[PDB]
């Protein structure tokens, strides 16, 4: 029976494993059953953003040296997913998640289970393609066997690792007779987001094949998923299932817009947590975040878009914490930008995690 | 009998003048009426934000113009407030008080008040010290009075323009022998910000006047008002006081109402102060006229134990993150992001918190 | 015989009118005759820059009071370009262009000569494409009637004000069945100054008509002029040139000259187009009245094989690292960093570079 | 007999030791006998920039997996020295100082000599004042010493690597009983900066010490080194010192010499200090290894008299603008970008100035 334990952990900076290692040390956590970390770490966010890169080499010589493996294994053992960017009052925290095999009975209802897969790798001309979709909707519902979970409905978050585009790698592309989704790394970056976002919610069922294309995966925004999460294959399904024995279950809405706090509860509400003195329950909130392509919130102006002094993923992140932490009572949240295809335009799905009664 | 009129005008730049133009075209506004505008400028709000400027400028040719005075006269006539920055999803807009004397009975009860008051001029090695405080609190009590309101407690804001140090009145001090509180002007900024709001919490009786020294005007954030909003600029002269709250002697079908933000995401005390404006529920927001908030980055770099970088990002300014923040979390209660937000919140509030008011529409009066 | 007139103001803020009301006050500037201003102000240079037309609205203001005109009847009279930023060590100041028909011979040789010329308002879905070109290119020849200039090779600056796209004008083009180059008001920035220099090379003779398209209005980089200097407009919607330049017709006392910047640090183009103007040496320095010159990052993310971080760094904008180091250049060649550096060059220079013009007084 | 050589090579990302592995694997340098490597790091060079702790974990890293030592003992064998901030043009880098024992006869005259030293560790209360300068001139003393130069005038360049307060050692200091000078990490790391760059000028005889006093350390800014280059950082603990120069005893194929920026436009002093280092042409100025420069926002304001807004502009810190001027000043003087530009040079050059470098091969 498999036991599904979610750590929220403080960091003082990209590379603060004290947290961790306190929870490895008092063995409240085994380090071989870490299946997943996801952080929020202090950097920019940008594309030249280098702290990612050190949380994730950090954590991971940390764990080779308690495990006593090579830090490439873990890489390929352990999923690593450093949004950058805490605008705002946003705290640097780590999220990590612990799959234990244990022989226990569930408790009553459905418990946390989640669920890991792994797609083909992508040739250059396929991404931002059907064939990512695809490939991602594949190993969705292979995690989904993984987690034990049947029902789409129970599915909760869709967390994806998805690759990029380099100037050698259209080089190879053009060498080969092939041209690429668009010229740009960086664009590419939202064409890759946007396919595996698609092919999450046409896994999952929230929009149907017959409205899905190529031409579809940058322009039309009506199609999105209500609970895709993707970062620039490796997944990560995380979702309720009647064959777990967790202490804690997941729930989730979708913000229509930046400062939809209704969502936020809707979502609270959805893993249990039926009013605010049981705020404490939480053991964590995940939200995407963007800045909406109408430049107003509720016919309203802002400047986020025309602002170059602070780019537009950085005051989506900054608000949408500030919007969380005003529902929930706490700063300590993630939240992540960049969300084509995943929510409406200018909103994003939101999750909690939460101990059960 | 005196009745205020309160509009809230989207801007679709610094200079933008066409909402206004519209209300005193349609005869909603007559210019002649208007006592003040306070603004929300698109700029980067800080010293070097010149769209502030471009706005009063804006506004002042615009009703010179459409009064027949100079603008001289139009800048003597009427309060121009800009607060540049709107960071997040704040909405850059204007909002203009009117005052009409007009012929009606007051409203049941207490209705919205207006008023106004100016300071003597200050020496420069005043700025910052208890002779401010002091000439403040009495420009309060008289503006007071001239708003018909004789309860502290029915003051609901209280609006400063406040002076600065320059090189100029610095080397005036040193000359006649005299040091100012502080050789740089942006702590001056601070340090005159924070004197008037003292002096607006020592005229309410918020605080005792044995607990304010010098010493206590930059160091004692225990020390501060619930209703001060303090704000520095180019004129730098005397300092412009603008009391309003509500009186029983008003014919206004508005009502302002107001609470403390605690940290940046108190969303509690959007509440009460919601409340406190006469919106019992969610339903009633409609009524809003406008929000007016003090916003800040706390000194301990934390939001209730919990770390964020505002204070060292060498990229966005913290005073920029914390509008941003505080205007999201205001948008978030009553679903709307064009509200006012100002930063520097010296003795407004408690260090990272600040005041928060609403006007509103009163109901079934 | 017509003689053009320079000064170079220092300003104190995007409002500072008072270097220009001084020299007016003295008797130096006669108002009436100034035909243009060209100012570098203080704020971000962005979209939501408004030192810009708080620097036009302050001078206009100041005009209209001085000349007993309106202030509309000012802005229809007078060229007013204010290029936002001033990074780096870039001093914020205008340069102040009078025009005055005098009773005088022809100085020996060429000697500065200036021309203004409008272009229709254009359709916003005009905008970036050949249509604007064309008219760019009528105009570019029109000023240059205008300076009594008949040798391209005369024209030494050609600054154009430029209109953009708002979403207004895109709906409005939409309504009738048409569609725009790009549904992106910065991209539209883009295109209108690309069109708009092209357009002038087209005059000039820089490039060939066959090798312009549409298509190649802002994808074939080897396409630019060399003197062409281009700003998306505030608030006007058309064209706006002047065309500066050298000819035997005038009676300046000072000459115009330039170069061309083959990358951000070609500090001898600063010297060849300072030689170009009669300045042989640092020691005929002091004879500058202004340098002007366009800048921008090399698309390359390279300056001759190195890397650099100017198009990945979110944080400053590439536009305003390539005002900081390319006015750095200029300021240890002359001296001075108080000369006019504006960003944003498609189609002028070479990618990564951009021209570079110097007016200097002449020694006879 | 001592050989310095030094090695200027182009990074990817901060993390990217390609070119360094390079260099080992074809025998141009042995690892054990690297003494430093000095690195420009593209991150924004703020406080909250971790690409320089991220080159130097990787470096150690690297190194150690080649030395067969740990990672605590390659820090402790090799200077890092990571500078954040690649602004304008400026190209991410490393340079890499090897020095080797050879058995060959001293090369004529003066050529590269290099030394090192370390202080003892400093207590809280210790930062930004007397004591700091003071153990700062005994290590440059000793430093000297190590690389065989016994005249101030034949020292070109002092990188000091010091250290700065943290929270931890202010609730140190304050549960002794002591006052720290400044109450703040941020403003410790200048006045560490500035307090190490004193001693430097003090160690060479280039101000006397009757002329430096607590009060002087953040404000006299008459008192400068101008070959000093100090840097702070949280990374590693911060008591290194090196020392670098010229000596009649070495047998070294480089030179370097030094001159001092009056403004962040002077390139004039470029000029010279390319000169100084044996380039008296432009069609010698292939033989630079590397130039070694700190960049300033004037207190002014100002430069030769002219405004600017680098000191008002709250979106980019004035450090930011000050390395991408020098930078682009430096590499329109020698036709390169790859150049090292530093930022926050207090008592280092005149107040909008700082020192310059060159280190360059002989003919």
């Known amino acids: 029976m498999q036991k599904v334990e979610v750590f929220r952990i403080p960091t003082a900076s990209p590379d603060d494993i004290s947290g961790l290692a306190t929870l490895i040390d008092s063995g409240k956590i085994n380090p071989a059953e870490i299946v997943a970390?996801?952080?929020?770490?202090?950097?920019?966010?940008?594309?030249?953003?280098?702290?990612?890169?050190?949380?994730?080499?950090?954590?991971?010589?940390?764990?080779?040296?308690?495990?006593?493996?090579?830090?490439?294994?873990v890489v390929k053992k352990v999923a690593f997913?450093?949004?950058?960017?805490?605008?705002?009052?946003?705290?640097?925290?780590?999220?990590?998640?612990?799959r234990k095999d244990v022989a226990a009975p569930a408790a009553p209802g459905?418990?946390?289970?989640?669920?890991?897969?792994?797609?083909?790798?992508?040739?250059?001309?396929?991404?931002?393609?059907?064939e990512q979709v695809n490939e991602v909707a594949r190993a969705?519902?292979?995690?989904?066997?993984?987690?034990?979970?049947?029902?789409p409905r129970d599915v909760h978050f869709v967390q994806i690792k998805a690759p990029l585009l380099t100037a050698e790698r259209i080089e190879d592309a053009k060498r080969r007779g092939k041209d690429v989704v668009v010229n740009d790394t960086y664009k590419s970056?939202?064409?890759?987001?946007?396919?595996?976002?698609?092919?999450?919610?046409?896994?999952?069922?929230?929009?149907?094949?017959?409205?899905?294309?190529?031409?579809?995966?940058?322009?039309?925004?009506?199609?999105?998923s209500s609970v895709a999460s993707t970062s620039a294959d490796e997944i990560i399904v995380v979702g309720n299932s009647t064959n777990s024995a967790s202490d804690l279950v997941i729930g989730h809405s979708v913000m229509k817009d930046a400062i939809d706090a209704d969502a936020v509860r809707a979502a609270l509400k959805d893993?249990?947590?039926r009013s605010d003195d049981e705020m404490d329950r939480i053991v964590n909130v995940l939200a995407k975040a963007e800045a909406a392509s109408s430049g107003t919130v509720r016919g309203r102006r802002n400047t986020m878009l025309d602002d170059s002094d602070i780019n537009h993923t950085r005051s989506a992140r900054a608000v949408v914490n500030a919007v969380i932490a005003s529902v929930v009572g706490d700063p300590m949240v993630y939240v992540s930008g960049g969300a084509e295809h995943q929510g409406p335009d200018g909103?994003?799905?939101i999750a909690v995690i939460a101990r059960v009664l």
Not at 42 to 64: H, I, K, P, W
Not at 81 to 98: D, K, L, Q, R
Not at 140 to 151: C, F, G, R, S, W
Request: a negative charge; charged letters at 20%; hydrophobic letters at 45%.
């Open 37 to 73: 970390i996801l952080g929020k770490t202090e950097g920019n966010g940008s594309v030249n953003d280098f702290t990612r890169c050190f949380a994730t080499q950090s954590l991971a010589m940390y764990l080779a040296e308690k495990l006593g493996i090579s830090r490439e294994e």
């Open 81 to 98: 997913i450093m949004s950058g960017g805490t605008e705002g009052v946003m705290t640097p925290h780590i999220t990590v998640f612990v």
């Open 110 to 130: 459905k418990r946390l289970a989640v669920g890991v897969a792994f797609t083909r790798d992508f040739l250059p001309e396929e991404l931002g393609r059907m």
């Open 140 to 151: 969705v519902k292979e995690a989904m066997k993984d987690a034990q979970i049947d029902d």
């Open 189 to 224: 970056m939202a064409y890759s987001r946007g396919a595996s976002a698609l092919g999450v919610a046409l896994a999952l069922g929230e929009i149907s094949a017959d409205k899905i294309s190529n031409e579809a995966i940058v322009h039309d925004w009506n199609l999105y």
């Open 271 to 273: 893993a249990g947590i």
């Open 347 to 349: 909103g994003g799905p």
